[PDB]
Structure formats: C-alpha cells, structure tokens
C-alpha cells in the first residue's frame, strides 16, 4: 500500500512544465539586467512586458492600476499593512485596522506587531459557514479605521469571502481594503474591479507558478510608501534586481490558471466531490464549510474518534501527502452535530485533515485515497477505547 | 561583429551547473519544506547542503545566523530599518554612518530614515575612491546606531577596509552593517576575519539565479523582522522558501569561492590587459588604483567624449557595459586624475565601466580593444577640442 498523491495543492502547486519552459532561457541565455541599457539587459524586456499584460489581464485589472512584482505574498502583505500604518496612523488620524481570525501568518503577526506599535486591530471572528460578513465589518468601522484586510478565500477551509460586498461596505465609509487573494487565483473567478478591492496580494506558486515571486495589485495607482526602497524598480515601488525567471513564470501560470478555471470547476469539482462524499460515508465524519461556498479544490474532514495528526502521518506513511486545518464543533440549525472553521489559536480547535486537489490529479489518485483514508480511519478507530 | 558581456558588476549568468543544481526543484521536487509529508521534506537535504555552502563560503560560524532574502536590497533595507527600529525609535540613538557611494538600497533608505528625523552622515569618499577607518572613527557619536559601509564599490571596485573599520567599530560599541555584494567571488570574504556584525549579498552577481539574496547576522544578534509571519529562517524571515533560488545560491557560492582561490590569475590577467590597452589610448585615466581593485574592474574616463556616447558606441559593436560616477581632480604632484564622487555631485562626468567574469575569454577581449580603440577615434573625431 504505497503510492505517491499529491492533496495538498493549497499549501504549494506543481510547476507546470509549460512554465518552467518558458523561464528556462532567462537564467543563461537571457541574463542581462533589465535596468541597464545595451542589449544584453534589453533582450529580456518584450518577456517582462508580456508577463505584465498576462498579470493585468488575468486578474482584470485596468491600466490606471498597478501590479507590483513582490518576492511573495508574505511580501506584500507586510508592505500593505505597514505601508498604510506609516501612511494613515503614524502620519495620519487613523488608528484602527479590522481583519479577520482566519488569516495567513503574514497578516495576523504584522497585525500583532502593529499592535504593539499603538495600531487598533479587531481580529473578527468567523461564522459557522466559515466566512466574514459584510454587515458586521460594517458595523466595526470607525471614523479612525485605516484599513479592512479580509482574505478572499481561506487556505484551510476554502470557504469564499464576499468580497464584493465587504468592498461596497468598505466604499460607502471610505477605507482601504485590502485582499489575500492567493487562495482565488486559478480556483476562483477573479475581477478586481467587481471585487472593489484596493489592494490585492498573491503569489506564484499556489497556482502552479516557481517558488519566490509574488504580486500586489494596487487600484489607480494608489499612494503605499515602499517596504523597499532604491532604485526605480517596479515604478520606484518596489527596489531590487527584477526576478526575471520569476515574473516571466508568473505570468505564464497566471494565463494558465485562468485558462484552466472552467477544467477546475468542472471536473477538478467532480473528482473533491468524489472525494468527498466517499469519505462522508464513514460514520462520525463531519466536511467543515458548506460546499456551495466552497473552492472547488479543497476538503477539509473532521473525523471524531481519531486524532488528525496521526491521521495525516499515516496517509503519507501510504505516500498521500494533505495538511491541517483547526476546527471546532457546534450545531446546525436543525440541532445535528458539525463542525466549523475557527482560528488555530483557540482553545476549543482541534486538527481536522485537509486535501485540496489541482488541475493534475488523476481518478486513480482519488480512488487510492478513498482507500486509504478508509483503512487509516478503521486502524486508529480499533485502537482506542474511548470511540464508540 | 562579436557580442560581448563587460557588466558582471551589475548582473552575471547563471552557472549551467548552477542551473542543472536548480532543475529539480521546480516540477520533480515541488513539495513545501514547512510541509510533514514526504513530498514536502524531499527537498530537505538538498537546502541543508545549501545552507552549509552559504556558511562555508562567507566563513560564518555555527553561532551565526544567514537568513536568506529575497535580495540583496530587501537585506540592506531590513538591517537599516530594523536597526533603526531597535535602536533608535524605542532607543537613545539617532545617527546612521555611511558612504555617498552606497547602493541606492542603501542610500534611498538612508534617506527615508532622514525624513524619519535620523541623522546621517554619507561620509564623502577619498582620492582612492574608499572611506578610511579614522574617519568614521572621528564621526561616531554616543547615539550613532550603526554604521553601514559598502564592502567594495560597483562603480570603480575599490575594496573597502573593513576589517579596520570593523575595530574601530567594536571600540565604539557600534554595530557594523556591509554590503558584500561586489565581495563575493571576487575577493577574500571571511566575516570573522572582516568583524562585520552584518553583511548583505546577491547570488546574482557570482552567477547564482536572480530573485535570491542573503542576510549574515553575527551571533544571531537580534534584529527586528522586515517580514513577518511564520517561522521560515529561524522565524526572522516570513515567507515561503525559493528552493530553486535557495540551491542555486549554495552552488554558486560554492562554485565562487573555488574560482576565486585558483582561477582569479586568469580574470585578473584579462583585465590587466584590458586595462593597459585601453590606457596606450592618449588622455585616458583609470579610475581607483589597481592594487586595491577587483579582479575584474576598470571604470576609465575618456578625455572629450562622453561615458554615455562611448556606452552607446559600444553597444552598437556588440560590447555591453555600464556608467560609473567619477570627477576631475589632481594628485599630490598635482598630475591630473580622475577620481570617485557620489553621482550627485555637479562635478561628476560618466566614465565608462567594463567589468569581467571567469567566462570571459581572451579572444572577447581581444575584439573589445579593438572596439574601443576605434570608438575613441570614431568619437574623437566629432566630439569637443578633439
């Protein structure tokens, strides 16, 4: 019993071989620095300018608007919060930022950080449909908010956030918002102009992209003081030697996502669906999220007598790879036991297993993987004498 | 007609053993290393092996720290603002020491933290285009948080003395911050020897892949996170790991630190012979003296034409180069010189910047003194008094 599955996609994607193609020629046939003026830097400029026209048009975004190359989305979510803590609250008359319990590391510990530099932060709560709604951060802001950072869509249980109408809240009290948009490329429609956002992060390779380069996108242009400072580099907003490889690739997945969006909704869908349902079969089984908010791409699976993280050691122990997502229970409105997304710092989460798919998987994985997970439940079920 | 690269100093081409180092690691070995499944530890030993060339090649110890960036702006702009953020905004400090010649990664960030309320003193650059170690000695205060000197210049590769100032430093009790990018591959770098507290590197420069950069801290000394989030690099560094960039850096370095203790005669020869035939040319003056110089360095100011036309006449013969900031003095015989400058001073003129690698070839620079001879004379001809 061993082969090797990939079902932890939300964490990392393969590059696509097409990708890596096309970033091959620009480490030793096409090294020239782009800033420098002979044709060595110059011969890697029409790539650069292609790669940005993919970037604009696979998101959507408009001419007035920017799209900074960063190193990562860590990257630029750092630069978005402390660019606008410089800019409105420590020469400005804000002093409040509103996001969520659900967000990636980069924003929650730039949050805590800001926190112990004066900054307000409200970190909302998530509701049993594992989303943020638009009324409450309605009701949180003040007339000293700076900034609202939702993500689009969470990484452990790819629940999808209403962005666009969290974007009209934000337009009606006049405030910033800002979004982590990494888990909506290549599973997700994505227009930044119907989403209303002001800021956008992303990175690369979480849609099948190389590791170390990422993007933030910023409406008209909008004024963000520079988390890298020098050289004119990304219109002055961005210093250091362009990632050329990098953005040449990004771009490319970027096309490719967008091109297999409508693959990912309908048979990507098929086969969690598949999935899915085969591993609610198992009694005391709960999926968090409802579905019909849902990426198309991700599980997340309460089991309740065993323990996730021996689960997920022994599915790679049969050479499936998944993850971990906090959960904790409550009840529905017919009063039946589930289980909803929490933060990970709460006391009443425990580790469900997370399996989130892409574009390459196979039937044949899925089936393996029904298998497995079945045999994996049934042997740490034996084991216990608590389970009933 | 032959097409050839003199701008090693502003970028270099990746090794093809860099390069296959690299391949895997993009769709073979995809897995994320914060991952437990195997997919994700796959790449585990090869980061290790990475790791340990990066600290082999700079001579760190087991103590040290080497956090991994983005590149080599994204270390500098973190050690200036951090330092600033430990030491001066919630400290008793408020002054910052560097050079007029610095990076723009080093000096625009300077300059913000002027318009922050931090003095600092870019401290003006000598005939041999270097900083000596008195100076900053006579410029340190009780409250100067740091003082960050480029380790060898861009423009001209003059290496910069910084084992002196790093003595001077620790007398002060003063951190010492130093960008080593034009260090790596071209001279000696031993950051225990050299008594840096902070050292900033690019792995494009020694033919690693662009987008990666490195950070050395001294004892794990504490600085404060320009990225924050996860626990990557120790947790002083947020942000999922370039594992090809990651690689690729530790068999560059690797690769550097070997082509630098026996083939730099070779690199070395080709620029001296570049450099005395470029100087057979009348009126021609190197700038920086050669016995403080890289090995692959020559920033030559031509009497009557312009650095930029001379670039642009160049590049028309295949010949690719950069600028580099340089005025008009004299010497101690009052010979005329010319001679480093910040490039914002108004008696700076453009001299041209040629700059090898260990591939360069002796026939590339055979065609390049042949090429500039004829665009000196080309030029010459159409040009000023000439």
Redesign the interface.
């Known amino acids: 019993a061993h082969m090797?599955v990939?079902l932890?996609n939300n964490?990392?994607?393969?590059?696509?071989?097409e990708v890596?193609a096309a970033?091959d020629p620009y480490?030793?046939q096409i090294?020239?620095?782009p800033?420098?003026?002979?044709?060595?830097?110059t011969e890697c400029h029409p790539a650069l300018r292609k790669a940005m026209d993919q970037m604009y048009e696979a998101i959507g975004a408009r001419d007035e608007d920017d799209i900074v190359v960063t190193?990562?989305?860590?990257?630029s979510?750092?630069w978005v919060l402390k660019g606008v803590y410089f800019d409105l609250i420590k020469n400005g008359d804000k002093d409040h930022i509103i996001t969520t319990e659900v967000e990636?590391?980069?924003?929650?510990?730039?949050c805590?950080?800001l926190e112990e530099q004066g900054v307000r932060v409200t970190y909302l709560p998530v509701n049993q449909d594992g989303v943020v709604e638009a009324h409450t951060v309605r009701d949180f802001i003040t007339d000293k908010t700076a900034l609202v950072s939702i993500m689009w869509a969470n990484n452990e249980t790819g629940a999808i956030f209403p962005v666009e109408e969290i974007s009209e809240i934000c337009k009606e009290k006049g405030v910033l918002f800002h979004t982590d948009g990494v888990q909506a490329i290549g599973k997700i429609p994505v227009d930044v102009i119907r989403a209303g956002v002001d800021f956008m992060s992303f990175?690369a390779?979480k849609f099948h992209g190389?590791?170390?380069?990422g993007g933030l996108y910023i409406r008209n242009g909008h004024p963000l003081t520079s988390?890298?400072?020098?050289?004119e580099h990304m219109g002055g907003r961005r210093?250091?030697?362009?990632?050329?490889?990098?953005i040449v690739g990004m771009g490319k997945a970027m096309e490719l996502a967008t091109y297999y969006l409508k693959f990912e909704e309908e048979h990507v869908r098929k086969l969690r669906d598949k999935l899915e349902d085969a591993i609610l079969e198992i009694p005391d089984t709960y999926s968090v999220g409802p579905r019909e908010n849902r990426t198309p791409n991700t599980i997340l699976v309460s089991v309740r007598g065993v323990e996730g993280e021996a689960m997920?050691?022994d599915?790679?122990r049969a050479?499936?790879?998944?993850?971990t997502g906090s959960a904790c229970a409550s009840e529905d409105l017919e009063a039946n036991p589930i289980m909803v997304a929490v933060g990970a710092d709460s006391e009443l989460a425990h580790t469900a297993v997370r399996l989130s798919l892409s574009r390459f998987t196979t039937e044949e994985e899925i089936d393996y993987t029904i298998e497995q997970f079945k045999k994996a439940v049934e042997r740490l079920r034996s084991i216990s004498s608590s389970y009933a």
């Open positions: 090797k990939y932890d964490a990392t994607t393969i590059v696509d071989p890596k970033m480490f030793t090294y020239g620095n800033n420098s003026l002979h044709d060595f830097g190193s990562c989305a860590t990257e979510n750092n990636h590391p980069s924003v929650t510990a730039t805590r950080w990175s390779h190389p590791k170390g380069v988390l890298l400072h020098g050289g210093s250091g030697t362009l990632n050329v490889p990098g997920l050691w599915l790679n050479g499936i790879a998944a993850s």
